[PDB]
Design an enzyme around this catalytic site. Sequence first.
Site, PDB file in Angstrom:
ATOM      1  N   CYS A 349      -0.133  -3.037   0.413  1.00 39.38           N
ATOM      2  CA  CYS A 349      -1.004  -1.855   0.467  1.00 39.38           C
ATOM      3  C   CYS A 349      -0.540  -0.740  -0.469  1.00 39.38           C
ATOM      4  CB  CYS A 349      -1.133  -1.329   1.894  1.00 39.38           C
ATOM      5  SG  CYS A 349       0.371  -0.584   2.538  1.00 39.38           S
TER       6      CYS A 349
HETATM    7 NA    NA Z   1      -2.888  -4.152  -2.469  1.00 43.30          NA
END
Ligand code: NA
Length: 374
Positions: A349
């Site tokens: 992320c």
């Molecule tokens: Na990513």
Amino acid sequence: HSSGRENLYFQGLERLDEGLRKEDMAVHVRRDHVFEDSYRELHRKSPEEMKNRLYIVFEGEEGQDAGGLLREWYMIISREMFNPMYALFRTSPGDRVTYTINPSSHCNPNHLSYFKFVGRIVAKAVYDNRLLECYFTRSFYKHILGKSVRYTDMESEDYHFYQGLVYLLENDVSTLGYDLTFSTEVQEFGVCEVRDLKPNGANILVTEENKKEYVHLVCQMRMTGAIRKQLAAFLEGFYEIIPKRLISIFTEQELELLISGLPTIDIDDLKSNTEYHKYQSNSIQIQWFWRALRSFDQADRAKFLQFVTGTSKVPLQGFAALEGMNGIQKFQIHRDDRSTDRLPSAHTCFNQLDLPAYESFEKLRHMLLLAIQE
Ligand code: NA
């Protein structure tokens, strides 16, 4: 992968085809209604019918090259599949670029049958070795493969909850100050409930020797609890074309590469778009990193991308357009500082590689590759 397995899978697929003689089959469609006309035209077909040669007819527009049209059509279904208007698929909040089932899909009262349909399409494409620009979450690929989600996969799906899981794992259970239970909240079809993770779950406290089983159970529940019926429907459509035992030969990374194909990694582009924390451009294991990555065939390059990024998808605008949880986020490498017998780890992320200060090139290379698969 091609070292045996991929090829058994084709062998086994061809064996179910034994004695199936395929036909040509019309898909009558309007240009502004491609997706819904396609649904109406194909959802009531049999699985065997669905193995036919498709040819597509765009209502009232001049006769066209059949091959070019079918290609055009697959491309449209690919983009329209993920149109927010239908409320079927939703982006990963961590990875921004990847999709799973939208828990709020029930506001479309046909969602269940549209899910079976989209399942058939995806599987028809794979079946016929047609590549789609569809990019799902790894949890989703794991669902098609009947593989359980690890708590790791939760970072890009629900950050706070993942943080909750890590904290529990690294701490003593009475050190928490509060005590957890074998149950969680789930909002299926709009309705909130607290579901047990096992019989009497709500009355069973998590303990130091509970906590692993708890973490396992709660992730499955959290990831599929709101989704159950939609997934079943998707899985129904898919398994009717490619049986589950056949597709299960692949890992989650492999499965993705099979649907959308192998990505191209321009390493000058990636290198020109990389950030460093603690390391410098010229720290020895960064130089070793680039040297290593460049020595990877494209299989391993693609898998590295999946590892660090959460997807095989290279952005249309290049790696300057790489996205993460907090928005635009370039690939970045940190020195972690824990012991050197660790594998490298990723946090997708943040498009982030945590790389330990390895003593030698050959060690780094060997250790990176390991991290790229198991
Ligand atoms: Na990513």
